């Protein structure tokens, strides 16, 4: 039985959040800091926020700030031997290291 | 366990001479004399003391120690016959037909049983005397084994009663044994 390729398929706990941080977006402190080109970021999807949700296929990875469009940022990530760009709102980005 | 060094002695009774050689034992006594071989006592050394029997061995197993005592019992039994006579007893009980037995040299014959016209026979080992007085059979001899196997041979012959009949306690049977004489 082939599984449906739903955009959130097979995520029964990928988008589950530890109960200690439920509710509306707590971490305003992370968002307020601004990125510039060449910065390195880590993607951590917030299941609560329905805006600009990146696909699960690139979660928990290393990202590079290559530019800015609108309220959101675009991020370059290597997955295989190719290149890809992920345009995302900042509320799933945490600085590296 | 492991029996380390077990030693036993046999005090040879008087009026007896004992000869030992080539791991072959012979005992002479007033009642009689029989030669008994003991070449099969591997792992056991036999010392013939001038006035007793010295038996020693080192580090015997569970098997050997039973063997050693087993050897011991026969030798004194060998001694016992040469001094005191072995007298097995065979008592005969019959229900409907009286039982008759006669001696034939080294062979025994019994007939007039519960109705069968056939003959029954048993073998007697050489050098063994067996007689009948009445209602009882006397088995004489020095060697303890010789009489019993001879006595048993009679017992097998008279066992034939046991086919598809509940046993009628009829035939030749062992009574007692070993009068002091």
């Amino acid at each position: 039985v082939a599984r449906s390729k739903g955009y959130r398929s097979k995520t029964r706990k990928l988008l589950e959040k530890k109960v200690r941080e439920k509710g509306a977006i707590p971490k305003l402190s992370l968002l307020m800091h601004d990125y510039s080109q060449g910065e390195y970021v880590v993607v951590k999807i917030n299941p609560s926020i329905h805006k600009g949700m990146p696909h699960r296929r690139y979660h928990g990875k290393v990202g590079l700030v290559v530019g800015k469009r609108g309220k959101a940022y675009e991020v370059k990530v290597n997955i295989g031997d190719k290149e890809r760009v992920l345009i995302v709102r900042p509320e799933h980005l945490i600085p590296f290291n | 366990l492991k029996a380390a060094y077990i030693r036993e002695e046999i005090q040879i009774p008087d009026k007896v001479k004992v000869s030992l050689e080539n791991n072959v034992l012979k005992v002479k006594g007033p009642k009689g004399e029989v030669i008994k071989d003991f070449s099969y006592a591997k792992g056991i050394r036999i010392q013939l003391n001038e006035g007793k029997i010295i038996l020693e061995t080192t580090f015997a197993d569970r098997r050997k120690k039973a063997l050693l005592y087993s050897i011991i019992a026969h030798i004194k039994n060998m001694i016992t016959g040469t001094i005191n006579g072995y007298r097995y007893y065979l008592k005969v009980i019959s229900t409907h037909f009286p039982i008759s037995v006669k001696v034939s040299g080294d062979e025994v014959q019994v007939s007039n049983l519960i109705g069968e016209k056939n003959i029954r026979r048993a073998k007697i080992l050489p050098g063994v005397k067996v007689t009948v007085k009445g209602e009882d059979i006397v088995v004489e001899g020095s060697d303890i084994y010789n009489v019993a196997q001879t006595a048993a041979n009679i017992e097998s012959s008279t066992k034939i009663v046991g086919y598809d009949r509940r046993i009628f306690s009829d035939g030749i049977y062992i009574y007692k044994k070993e009068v002091i004489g």
Binding site: - | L1, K2, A4, Y5
Partner: protein
């Protein structure tokens, strides 16, 4: 001759019982090296116990006039 005292651990499915009918033995030997072989010799084959799970705990010498067993005693 320096009788020896051996008390060691050997296992299949937790066969530890530091007392006297499922765990350990006595030994008569000259030195430790000859003595240590004997426990390997017996327990190795007498009960299918590899030297893997052999763990000697205490090895020492007892004095020749006090051993609870007489069978080991009289053999001198």
């Amino acid at each position: 001759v320096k009788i020896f005292m051996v008390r060691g651990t050997a296992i299949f499915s937790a066969s530890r019982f530091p007392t006297s009918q499922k765990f350990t033995k006595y030994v008569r030997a000259l030195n430790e090296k000859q003595a240590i072989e004997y426990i390997y010799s017996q327990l190795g084959g007498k009960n299918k116990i590899k030297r893997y799970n052999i763990h000697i705990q205490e090895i020492k010498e007892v004095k020749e006039d006090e051993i609870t067993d007489k069978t080991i005693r009289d053999l001198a």
